[PDB]
Design a protein around this ligand. Sequence first.
Ligand SMILES: [Ca+2]
Ligand SMILES: [Ca+2]
Lengths: 33, 58
Amino acid sequence: TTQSPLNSFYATGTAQAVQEPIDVESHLDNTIA
Amino acid sequence: TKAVLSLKKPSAVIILDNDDYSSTNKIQLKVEAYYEAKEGMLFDSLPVILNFQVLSVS
Ligand SMILES: [Ca+2]
Ligand SMILES: [Ca+2]
């Protein structure tokens, strides 16, 4: 004679974010002379 | 069908006569059950008992 609560069910996922939106690189190779 | 038994009205009275006594010596009666179980209740090895009593014979 056991009474159960009937709520022992689960499901699991994951998420992440490990980088910045943009990357910037420079090529200014001229001199104001 | 001779009687219907339930948990609210457990008792009934039936009559067996010349037509029922086939093979002149025996009566055959099967049992039919309708039920709804309680929510979230678990159990095993539970007996169901029926009783017979004679009121008059001729
Ligand atoms: Ca970066
Ligand atoms: Ca008698």
